[PDB]
Every structure is written in C-alpha cells, then in structure tokens.
Symmetry: C9
Subunit: 190 residues, 9 copies
C-alpha cells in the first residue's frame, strides 16, 4: 500500500447553470477531493491520508495532547489537479414528425466534463505524472401526442426525459483519471 | 465509541431555480446535525460536539475565572460532505383528454449523494469512506371536465407532492453511517 | 416506579444558527429569509418559562461583558457559569412537500379552494460542559398550513351580474418554529427525567 | 427608578419587502433600542443608560478630560432580546359585487409582528426574564364604481386604501413588551 | 447658551425606493447631523460643537501644531437618535369620473416619517430625555381630458402632479423634536 | 485673505437614478470639494488649503525630503457640510391638445437640491455658521405632430427636450451658500 | 507691456479620479461607467505635449519604487521631486440636457432625424507643494453631440417596393474629456504667465 | 523536435486575462473561457518532454506535507532554471460568422455557422537573471454550426416534419490546442537560443 | 538593447458589454502587459524585464537559494500607461432595399480604442515620454433574401456578419504605440 496525501482539487471550469436556473449554482459539483479521495481508496492498494480537512484533525489532536496532561503519518507521493472544463451543446441534435393527427418527437444533447489529475512527488516536488481526461454527458426528451376531431374532440400526450447525472460521470471521469495515473506509475515503477 | 465530527459542508454547489430566490441553496446545510444525531441514535456512538466548539470553550473559560475539569477527546473522526444534487435526472408524465373530461399525471426525480469518511485520529489515515446516494420523488396529478349545456359546466381537481429533500438527506446521511459501522465490524477498531 | 429531579440547573445557550439556506421565492425579495433567525430567543424563552432552568444568556455575552467593564471602572463581582449547553440548528425548511386543491364551476356560480404545507425541522442538542460530551439531541419537525377559498358568480340578464368572495390564510411560520422548538425541549427534558444529571 | 443598560435589539425576522419595492428595503424598521428606550423613559420608574451610541460619548469624554489638562454611572440590569419575526399575508381576505352598472368591493390583509425582550441581571449575568409580544397589522382596500351606457356613456370610480404603519405597530408591540417585564419585577422584585 | 456635542444620527428606516427607481436609492435622506446641527444653531441659545467631521478638524490641528515648531472646547450634553421609520401608502386614495366625452380624475397618497431624538448627559452618561416625533408626506395627482367625435375627432389633456419633499418633511420632523427636547430641559431645569 | 481648509463634502442624498438608468449611477455628482473649493477660490478673498488630496501632497513632501540627504501652512477656519437631498417630481405637470389632424403637447418637471455648508472654527471647534441652500431643476419636453388623410396619406413630427444640468444647479447652490456664508461673517466679523 | 516664463517646471500629478458617479443606462451593463477613468494620463500627456512641463509620474509610483529597490539591491541614485501639484477631478457627466429631433413621412417616402447633447465637466487645481496652498483652479465643461438620420420608402405596385437608409454618429466621449482637460491646462498656464511662479 | 537531456520548468500561474463572460441565457457569472491553464499548460510541457514540470500549483499543499514529514522525524527540494508565464490573452465572437437557407413548398432547409477566437500568451523567462527569454502569442479558432431541414405540406389532413443537428466546438479544447502550439513555438525559440 | 521593466497597464475605460452579454464582461481585454511585452520583445532591441509576474519568480528564488544550504538584473527605463478608452457606436450606419420579391440590406458599426503608453526614467523618476494612439474596429452585416409567390410559394435567405477581433485590434493599437515611444527614444537617445 502506498500513502497518498491529497489536499484539494477545485472546480476550475468557472461555468454556471443557465436561465431559468440560479445564476449562483455551479454547473459542476465540488465533490472532488471526495470523489477522488474515495476512488483512490476503492482502487486499493491506496491509503488516502485525509488532509481535507487537516485543521479539524489538528484541533482534535490539541485536546488529546491536553487530556493527557501519538504521531502523524506522511505521504511520499501526492495527488493534485482540478476540474478542467464543462459546456454544451457540444454536439447535440434531434428530430420529430407529426401527421394527422398523431405527433411525435425526440431530442438529445451531449456535454463534456474534463478533469486534470497530477501525481507529484513530495520530497523532490517534481511532477511525476499528469493526465487530462474528458467524459461526456447525454440528455434526451421524447414526446408523443394525438389531436383528433369527431364533432366533440380528442387529444393525448405522453413524454419521457432523461438527463445524465453530471456528478456521476465526473466520478467516472475522475475514476478513469485514477486508472491512468496508475499506468504512469507502473513503468516507473516507484 | 467517542466520535468527533467537525464539519460537513454543502459541496453540491447548487441553488434552487426560478421561481425560487437565487440565494436559496437547493439542499439544506444542516449536516453536522443530521450526522451528529445519526451517530447518537445509532448508539453505541458518543458525539463530541465540535460545532460549536468555540462556544463550549468560551464557557469553560468563564467557569475558570469565577473560581479565581479537563476535556474528553475522540480517537476516531468522521468527515465528508454533500457530494451532489440535481434534477430532473430521469423525469416524465402522461395525460389524456376526451370530451369533455381531461386527466393528467407528471413526476420528477432528483438525486443526492453524500460522502462519509471515518478517519483515524492517532495516525490520521482514512479508515473508510462511503458515497451514498438517495433519490427524491415528486409528482402531480390532475383531473377536469369542460362541458356545454345552453350555460356551461366545468371542474378541476389536483394533488401535488414533493419529497422533503431535507428528509431524503436524512435518509442518505443515515444509510452511510450504517455502512461505516459495518466496515467497522470487520475492522474492527473494537 | 417513580421519577424525580433535584433542583434548578444552569444552561448556557449561545447560538442556534439557521442552516436551512432558504429564501422566499418571487414576488418576495431574494434577500428575505424563508425562515426567521429568531431561535436562541424562542429557545431561551422556552427554557425560562419551562423552569426549573436558568438560562445563562450569552446572546449577548459581549454586551454584558462591556457593561461589566463599566461598573468595575466607576469603583476605582463574579460571573456565574452554566453546567450544560444547548446547541443545534434549524435543520431546514421547504414546500410544497405535500400540497393541493380543488374547484368547480356551474353557470354561473364557481367555487374553488387550495392548500399548501411546509416542512420545518429543528435540531436541538444538550451537551455537557465539564467533559464536553453531548448528553442528548433531538430532531423535531412541524408542517405549515396555508389555504385559499374563492366563490363567484357570472350571470347574464340583458345588464349583467357578478360576484366574488375569498379567504386566504397562511399559518405564521414563525410560530411553527416556536412550536417546533417547544416540542423539542419537552423531549430533551424527558431524557433528563431518566438521567437525571440533576 | 432603576438604571437599565440597553445596548442592542436586532431584527431577526430577516424579512424584506416584496416587489415592486426595492429588494434591499426591510419589512420592519431597525429603530428598536430607541423605541425600546423611549418606552423605558416614559415608563418610569426607569432611567435608560444610553450605551447606543457609547463610543460617541466615550470620545467626547476624552475631549473634556484633555481640556482639563468625572465618572460614569453603571446599570444593575440589562435589557436585551430581538425582533422575533414578521410576516404576511398570514390571515387575509375580502369580498365584492357588481350589478349593472354599479360595482363595489373591499379587501383586507393582516400582518404579524413579534418581539422578544429579556431582562438579564448584570452582577451574576443570569437571565432574569424574557417576553415575547406579538401584535398584528391591518391593511384594507375599499372601492366603488359605475359603468353606465346611454348612447353617450358614463363612468365613475371612488376608492380608499390603507395600511397600518408597521413602524407604529411595533411601537405598541414594544410598549406592551415592556409591561410584562415590569410585572415580572413586581413579583421578583 | 449651552454647548451641544452631536456626533451621528443614522437613517435606521431600512427603507428604499420602489421600482422603477434604483433599488440602491434610500427612501429617506441621510442628511441628519446637518438638519439637526442647523436646527440647534437656529434654535439658539445653542452652540453646536461640530464633531461631524471631528477627524478633519483633528488632522488640521496637527498642521497648526507642526507649524509652530490651542485647546479644544467640550460639551456637557449630547444629542443622539435616528430616523425611525418610513412607509406608504399608509393612508391613500382618490376618485375620478368620466362622462361623454370629458373625463377627469384625482389621486393622493400619504407617507410617514418618524424620528428618535435623545438628549443625553456627557458627565454621568445618563439619558436626560428621548422623543419620538413623526410627520407625514402628501402626494397628489390631478388629470382632466376631452375625447369627442365629430366626423375628424377631438381630444385634450391637462394634468398636474405634486409630491411633498421627503427631505423637507424630515427637516419638519427633525425640527419639532428640537422644540420637544428644549421643553424637557426647561422644567428640569 | 483668509486661509480656509476644506477636507471633504460627501453626497448624502442617498439617491440613485431610476430605470432605464444603471442602478449604480448616483443621481447626484460626488464633485463637491471641487465645486466647493473653487467657489471659495473663484469668489476670493479665500485661499483653499487643498487637503483633498492631502495624502498625495504628503507623499510628494517625502520625496523632497529624501533627495536632500519646509513647513505647511494651516487654516484658521474650516468649511464643511454636505449634499442634503435630491428628488422628484416635487411639483410637476403639463398639457397638450390635438385636433384633426394636428396634435401638440408639452410637459415639465422640477427637481429640488439642497446643500449644507458650515463654517467651523479650528481652534475651539465651535461651528461659526451653518447654512442650508436649495435650488430647483427644470425639465421640459415639447412636441407637435400632424396626422392627415388624402387617399396615400400624410404625417409629420417635431420635438424638443431640455433637462437642466443637475451638476450645474449643484454649483449654483454651492455658490449661493458661500455667498451667504460670507455675509454672516461680515457681522462676525472674524475677517 | 510684455510677459515671459523662464525655465521648465516639475509637475507631480498623483490622481484625478472620476467623481461623475454616472453609469451608462440600459442596454449597457450597469457596470460600465459613462466616463473613462483615463485622466492622469490625459492630464499627463497634455503636460508632456504642452511642454515645457515635466510629468514626474507617480501613478505608478510603486512600480517605479519597487524597481528602484531592485537596482539598489543588484549593486550590493536619488529621486527628483516636483515643485507644483496638479489635482482636481472629473466633476460630472449627463444627458439628455438639451436634445431633440424632427421627421416627416408622406406616401410613401419617410425621413427623420434625432440628436442628443451631453455635458462633461472637469476640475483642475494647481496647488503649490512647499506651502500646500492652492494657487489656482478651473472648472471646464464640454458638450457631446449624438445624431441619427433615416429615410425610407413604402410603395405599392401589385408586387411591392420598400427601402431604408440610415446614418448615426455618437461623438467619442473619451475625447471630449481630452478636449475638456486640454482647455483646462491652457487657462492655468495663462495665470501662471502673469504670476509668474517662473 | 528533440529531448536531450531534461529541463526543469517551474510554472506558477497562467490566468485568464480575457475578462469575458457568457451571454444570456447562461449565467452572467460564468466565464466564457476555462481557468484550466497551469494544468493545460503543465501537461503541455510534460507531453512535449523533455520537460520536468516542478509543480508549484499547489506549492502550499506540498509545503504543509513537508512540515508533516519533517515533524514525523521529530530532505531537499529541486529548483528550476527556467520558468514559463503568461496568460490567456483574449476571446470573442461573432468575429467571422454566417449562414444560409432556402425553402420551397413545402420543403425548407437551412444552415448557420459562427467562429470564435482564442488567444494565448506564453513566455519563457529566465530564473537566474530574471530576464524574459521569449514570449509568444498563439491563437486558435472555434467552429459552431446549426443545420435544419423541414417539411410543411397540406392534403385535406396535413403533414409536417423536422430534422436538425447542431455542433459547437469545445472552447476548452481549442485553448488546449492553442496552448499546445504555443508550447511548440516556444521550443523552437529555445531550439535556437539555446539555453537547452 | 536596453533593459525595460514593464509592470502593469490597466484598463481605464471602464467599459462592459451590453445586453445580451453578461454585465460582468469587459468590452476590452485586460491582456495588455502581455501585448505590450511581446510587442517590445518583437520590436527588439528591447529586453523586457518580466515583472508581470515578479513575485512568482521571487518565490521561486527562495527555493534555489535554500536548495543550496545569483543576482537579479535591473532596467534603466520603465514602460507604463493605460488603456485610455473604448466605445461605440462612434460612427455607424447602414442601408437596404427590397423589391418584389428580392430584398437585401447592409450595415456597419465602427468602434474606437485608445491607448496611452509612457516611458519613464528610473534613476531620476521622470516621465521621458507618453503616447496616445487610437485605432478603430470595423463591423459589417450583409443580408439578401427572396420572397416569391406561385400557387405554392418560395423564399430564400443569405447573410454574412463580421466584427473585427478587438483583442487583435488592441494589439494593432499597442504596436503602433511602441513605434512612437521608440521614436522619441531616437532623438533622446538614451
Ligand atoms: Hg455520464
Ligand atoms: Hg426521501
Ligand atoms: Hg404554526
Ligand atoms: Hg398597531
Ligand atoms: Hg412634511
Ligand atoms: Hg441649474
Ligand atoms: Hg468630442
Ligand atoms: Hg479546437
Ligand atoms: Hg483592428
């Protein structure tokens, strides 16, 4: 098992959800340095060293130094990087048709999440490896309806919409980004 | 065991869309209450406070002064954050109208994920981490009648329900603690 | 069997901050909180009316502390502590949760009604001072009822006639909190019953 | 007469007037710890100690003291607390009817102010008492009108609208707010 | 004459102009401690002591002290307080009528300004008195016009509008409070 | 000549222009201590001591001091005060009339501005005088038009709109206050 | 009679800041000033091109002062001052002030024209360094014209015909300030001529 | 071109100097360009190896960690002889943009396109003397287009249909491309300098 | 070759794009002190001293010095100055005409950018020279269309819109600005 100290990985996309959505609400989740901290632990052997998060674990330790009137492991590597980019439509499209009296239609869009991960050495400060990874996000809407006349009248509508959970594919993106960093480490091999 | 939780912050970076005020977070910031109570009510666990600590510390200074008796710590620590939130994710609905009775039904789903990490104090290594995700159901149903006599007759009835997003977080923050202890079964640290 | 406490206990309640992170929607200004920040008043009056408890204040500490700088200076005499602490926060607020309504119209009389319910949760914690352990904590959750009722008449003569009546009531969210926090201290005291700590 | 040191009572309702009014404009005045003070002054026995406001007086004291090259009274109690809350519509309603060609109608809304005061002992710093007093605020609108045809035409409208002064409705709130605190000192004493 | 040191009186109304007017524009002038400092000056016997403003006079005095290589007058009372509250409609209304073809109508609104003024002693730091005075702000609009057909057509419009100067009424409000503060010192005396 | 130091006079009107205007744009200029300082100097006798502005003058005198390895005149009085208020419509209104087919109309509004200037003694810190002055601001719009038929058609339009320079009536106010500030001093005299 | 200067004068101008407090209206972003902040460039170029005068910098002072720190380090030589000082501000901006336009249409040819005038004001003070007294001050004010003309044709055939032409010009406000500030330096120099200070 | 050799490159920050934000509907707070430089840049130099990026993103976290190591014992840190700096110079659109379309009864069809421009400033600056060795401004372009085709027809009954496709190039990627050629060019200027 | 220390040139025009564009987006890039620096570099002889940018190199020098348990060049001049102005429409206009059934039209807007550069001596701290150079920025639109009836119907549309890349056009301005600053240094000559 190798000790990895990862402090923080910030959303650098600078991108925000469009109207009607709140202009304050980021279009990308800040869950990185959790998603990352777990995905290393799930890739075990790796033993995430916390430091999220350190000043809390530091406050606690004062108390244990106090209550008694015992050391703290470091990592010989470190991981870093950030969320690179997000946008849409990227590549997007759709079709639809209506005849008397039945209409139907379907639309879809893609998005692109990118993540930069870099394994950096602790002692020498040299960046041992860095990779940029990008996944894509699907969304689609489907509708069908009938307008028919009798004399009287008749109509009907059905629809289904699916939007891939941006949080989830970041994870996949930030997962695969872990997979890479390992390959980079194996031929080293450290 | 004695457990000290410091903070779990909303990392979702989301805010409720229009009509809602652009300042309203889409998810409640109340974790480190939800987590503190989920540990207590799942006892054995004994929360160490630390909300909040500076208050308790201010108070201990007062007692000391008028007197002119130590403070219990935790050997593990719980951390993590709210990973993500969104909607519609998967969503949809149907409806139909005949002369003159119409009726229709719609539904939305949301998701929320949380990251809960037990980390050792003494050596500061992360003992375990979990990402748990719940979903949030919303729905609306309506029925109505438009009919003529000659004069007229019409009627409408409807019911709308949104799952209490705060309470799904409770559900979500709960099921993580269960798992976190289950890893603690084979750990054991006990 | 039988329970029993002993005597009064001193409680220091510093702050309960609103964690709901919520603000009324439009037409209301985005700056108006959807929930009052008034807890640690409601909680405090709860404790003083629910005596035997002597809230130690500390709202509020600094103002008293400067005031003690004053008195001491005019003369050229100690300050009571608390044995426990109440803490915790407003867990969250929202709507519509459950909500709905009905209505119907015939010629020419129409009528309708609607209602919404809001869910508030509150978390209160009693934590010991000396050893700093949390003695107990409780999550309590109210709902908030609002409703509207309307009736009207559109009728022709030839000439015309119409009429409208309506009533709208929203339960004062402030009070639900006042009520939420009321049920929260009831509970907390019951564990102190079996405790006692008194 | 007792010396009361009254520092701050802050608006905790966190409420702001809705559209059309500016989103920065509070739904309730911030003026308490004045209204509270004028209550205490005109409610004697009491002698409000200032401390608003303090540094202004504290600075001024340096000037006198310097120009001379003589002490400052205390208060045995402290009055504190906040504005618990505000809201509307709470309860509201109204009616109206129109016949050819005279219509007439009326509406009303009720608003709610709550106030928390607390008397805390200075010497030991224990809370002596606390009071939550909530008044209500009436608003109403009255209208009458006529649309009449001749051929030629005629119409008329008269209307009157009123909202109570929430500034004032707080004054009554804070006035009875003081009453109960005096009483808890009647039985204390 | 009595020396009155007066530092600052803040607008506490928490009130802002509605739409279309800028949401950053106060509903009430920030002019106090001018309107107050001129009021006392015209109310003589009085000698307002500045302190607006003190730091400019304080910097300036370094310059006089440094140019030489002589004392500073203090006051035994102090005036304080704030602008308590503002709002409208309060009382409001209007009427109008239109016949073929002459129309006419008129409307009015009232606004409410309140002021807290306290006289406090500087030596012992006790509030000597405090007063809450209030005035109202009248606005009105009058319109009349003619729409008539001939065959061709004819129309005409006249209108007049007036809004009372909220800045003026505050002066009016901040004035009477001074009249009040004087009395309470007379029977004292 | 008298030495008069004036530090700063701020816009206290608390007012901002309505829509369409940028909500950030102050309805009244922050130009006081420019208009004021010159109204004292242009109406001389008086000798403005700067202090706008003093922080810079003091940085400069550091530079003189450094290259050499000599005093600074003061004022016996000080002027102060600020911009009291601005508003509308105050008094306002207008007329218009149209016949077939020629229309014409005119509209007018007034605004008010007040300014507070106070002469304060330096040595004792007494206020030697205080004055509130008020100007008013005129805005008017005039139009005329013709809609007439032939059968084909005809129409025409003309219009003109004047808004008095709010910046200027601040100046106009800031002078007349200084004018009055001098008069009261003639019976003081302090001059 | 007869006037005369003697030699070049050293001027330090630190800041002349926009005091207009004016912002462009809609459709502009609320954030865009209606006047450039470029004074203390405009002033300085005016003084360098209207030389004899020697702008002393001090914009800017820290960049130069941080740079002198470097040289003095790299070697291990004095700094010229100014004898006068130029100050003052941008006193204001506005519109519409005086504005207007006309137009007419007949079948089917229309035409129209509109125009606005703006007013900028600038205050420039010369204040002596050694004694701190203000030697002189000016308020200068330019105007800024904007105009628009358009003409068109709506005609029928049966088929159809129409046409549109138009031209709009808005004076470069930035420049009027440069013009406003120019006239302000000329006046000042004049009084200096009869002073002389030279 | 070539390695040798390895050169230590310590790159600190390259910040977006375009000062540009997305239009309506998208939030007025959202940048029209990534903040990802000094990631995009650091990985550029590394895949153009030989270069040995020295981190310093990022230095503070590596610094606390070194306090941890040093404390757990109660051992040096490599420097770089050159440095890269600079910024993302500018962004905009329409710049060059256009489109066409035509409809006959009852088939319509149409297409539109827009171009965007991204500029990057990279600089190689010497450490020892603190002198600029080089600076280069490289710019890419970003394509967007929309294609649609549709049918409105009558029978009596009726018929309609619509098909469409839209593509907007990833401004993230173009900047990654810009910064890439930006590095390429920077090599050549060192290729003839040389310092390498 | 003369050593030139170039620090900062800030946008003083205070301009921001109109609606629909965000109210936060400047009408002019902030990238000068790059555009100026590369100008000097390519107008060489000039040896720009960095100082963008200084503190990163300064922090870097703490590392090398300390890695060992070698001096830092000056400049005798300084380039300073600012972006004087930006605006529009300045001059703008356009025409168009339509006959049955062919229409067409064309439009144009011109923008003005101004720049102030200044050379200032270090040793005595005098401004040696200052230049104001102002370019313009061209924007034009072209449309043509056809509406014709048959019975049946026909229509067509073609268009082209170009605005000049103000970023480039700032370089154009900032370049010619160096000409005059070099030129006044010809007769200086320093
Ligand atoms: Hg995905
Ligand atoms: Hg749930
Ligand atoms: Hg309730
Ligand atoms: Hg009332
Ligand atoms: Hg009045
Ligand atoms: Hg005027
Ligand atoms: Hg001009
Ligand atoms: Hg690309
Ligand atoms: Hg250009």
């Amino acid at each position: 098992k190798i000790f990895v100290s990862v402090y923080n990985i910030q959303d650098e996309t600078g991108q925000f959800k469009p109207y009607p959505a709140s202009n304050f609400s980021t279009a990308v989740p800040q869950s990185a340095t959790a998603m990352l901290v777990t995905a290393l632990k799930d890739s075990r052997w790796f033993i995430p060293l916390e430091r999220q998060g350190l000043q809390n674990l530091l406050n606690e330790r004062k108390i244990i130094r106090a209550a008694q009137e015992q050391s703290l492991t470091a990592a010989n590597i470190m991981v870093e990087g950030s969320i690179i980019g997000y946008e849409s439509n990227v590549k997007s499209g759709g079709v639809g048709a209506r005849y008397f009296g039945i209409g139907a239609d379907t639309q879809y869009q893609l998005d692109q999440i990118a993540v930069n991960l870099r394994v950096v050495n602790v002692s020498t400060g040299e960046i041992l490896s860095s990779v940029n990874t990008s996944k894509t996000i699907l969304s689609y809407e489907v509708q069908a309806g009938v307008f028919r006349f009798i004399d009287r009248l008749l109509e009907g509508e059905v629809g289904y919409t699916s939007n891939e959970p941006v949080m989830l594919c970041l994870m996949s993106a930030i997962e695969t980004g872990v997979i890479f960093l390992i390959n980079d480490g194996i031929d080293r091999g450290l």
